[PDB]
């Protein structure tokens, strides 16, 4: 089998991507942000603190004749971002893109944190990355993905980001349409639960390539791209007028500056980010002050290859007996 889903942004800055998802019987499509980063399936739901919806739509798993609780489990999480949200669970037939898995684990929050309750354009998370980071308790469960992998026609899944734009998800197949040239593939550590790999390297704008080992991750459900302070502060000076702001919390720039791309390394092939990609806008409205879409990692304790670098690729994950992750130009 395979599956095919459209993902959107939610927003004019590309701040995160939305992809239905049918959950239930009837079908209930809720859209949901596929995360590689995390490996909780979980909705807003009628079980959510009423006061803390608002605007979302809800899975009810009383209306899904499919549904079916699972006694005693509980899930909580908390994401790099500072928020989090709790509940219980249920099994149910889900299905993305035309791709069905019947008894997967559908958390319900009953609580979620002041940041999910203010972004009405997500309905939940649908985690991708390895099912050992489940939070399920007592009895951890599998994500999506590794759910179908047996039914897949190859053990994969790939995302294709949009740059202000539309893209894909793809299960179960590579479409050797959507890239130019080859995908270069390269090793997985899965060690901290992360599709976590090591890039080669880094170029700023025209600049010559600096060959240097950077550990990170592969994170389709974080916005930007985090990186060492040396390299974050080699790209920012190279814009006119930019500086780390304590008050803002990151590197800012005015608004009037031309961006110079940021190539990645992924063996000995180079994934070029555009500058334009790097641009976030006015920290308020109205400011001439933008926030960048390369920051510091440190303190994060991890280096993240989030949506501004991935949007810049093609990316599989690969899921075989021993998992890779591969990057092509687009």
Excluded at 18 to 41: H, R, W
Aim: hydrophobic share 35%; aromatic share 12%.
């Amino acid at each position: 089998s395979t599956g095919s889903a459209t993902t959107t942004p939610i927003d004019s800055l590309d701040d995160a991507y939305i992809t239905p998802v049918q959950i239930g019987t009837p079908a209930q499509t809720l859209n949901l942000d596929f995360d590689t980063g995390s490996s909780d399936l979980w909705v807003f739901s009628s079980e959510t603190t009423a006061s803390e919806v608002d605007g979302q739509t809800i899975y009810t798993p009383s209306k899904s004749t499919t549904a079916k609780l699972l006694s005693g489990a509980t899930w909580s999480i908390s994401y790099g971002d500072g928020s989090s949200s709790s509940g219980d669970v249920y099994t149910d037939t889900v299905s993305v893109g035309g791709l069905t898995v019947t008894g997967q684990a559908v958390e319900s929050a009953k609580k979620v944190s002041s940041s999910f309750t203010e972004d009405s354009t997500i309905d939940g998370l649908l985690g991708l990355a390895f099912s050992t980071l489940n939070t399920v308790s007592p009895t951890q469960q599998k994500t999506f993905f590794d759910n179908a992998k047996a039914s897949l026609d190859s053990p994969v899944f790939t995302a294709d980001l949009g740059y202000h734009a539309p893209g894909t998800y793809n299960f179960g197949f590579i479409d050797t349409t959507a890239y130019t040239g080859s995908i270069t593939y390269t090793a997985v550590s899965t060690k901290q639960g992360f599709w976590e790999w090591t890039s080669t390297g880094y170029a700023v704008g025209s600049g010559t390539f600096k060959s240097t080992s950077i550990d990170g991750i592969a994170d389709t459900g974080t916005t930007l791209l985090y990186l060492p302070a040396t390299v974050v502060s080699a790209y920012w000076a190279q814009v006119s007028g930019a500086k780390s702001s304590s008050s803002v919390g990151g590197y800012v720039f005015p608004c009037s500056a031309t961006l110079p791309s940021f190539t990645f390394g992924v063996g000995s092939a180079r994934i070029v980010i555009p500058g334009d990609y790097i641009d976030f806008g006015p920290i308020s409205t109205g400011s001439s002050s933008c926030f960048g879409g390369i920051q510091s990692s440190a303190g994060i304790g991890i280096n993240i290859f989030g949506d501004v670098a991935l949007k810049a690729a093609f990316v599989v994950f690969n899921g075989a007996t021993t998992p890779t992750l591969g990057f092509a130009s687009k």
